[PDB]
Structure 1
Amino acid sequence: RVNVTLACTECGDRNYITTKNKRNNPERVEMKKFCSRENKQTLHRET
């Protein structure tokens, strides 16, 4: 259970912080979140 920075897969801007189990959700987690530059809801992976 640890801190997590997201980031958009077409600009590279973080835009979000959250937290996850590194055990239960171990992989590079990815979710769709608004991106304030494209003004579109975009897929954001972790970095």
Structure 2
Amino acid sequence: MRVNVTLACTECGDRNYITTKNKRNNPERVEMKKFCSRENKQTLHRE
């Protein structure tokens, strides 16, 4: 099933994002590389 998820920056200041994810297709937590406004650089977001 679909669950709305949020992405939090790692080891730095938080620049949150909102996406969607399927519960069965990706049972774990997804990680991506997104731009961070506070650090002014691309970083890794989890959860």
User: For structure 1, which runs of at least 5 residues remain unmatched after alignment?
Assistant: none
Q: Structure 1-normalised TM-score?
A: 0.85
Structure 2 residues not aligned, in runs of 5+:
none
Report the number of matched residues: 46
CA deviations 1:6-47 (Å, max 9, x no partner) are 00012252510100001101111100000111111100001x
Question: 4+ residue runs of structure 1 moved beyond 4 angstroms?
Answer: none
TM-score (norm 2): 0.85
Residue pairs, 1:1-47, within 5 angstroms: 1-11=2-12, 13-46=14-47
- Structure number, greater radius of gyration: 2
Over the aligned positions, Cα root-mean-square deviation in angstroms equals 1.2
**Percent of paired sites with the same residue:** 100
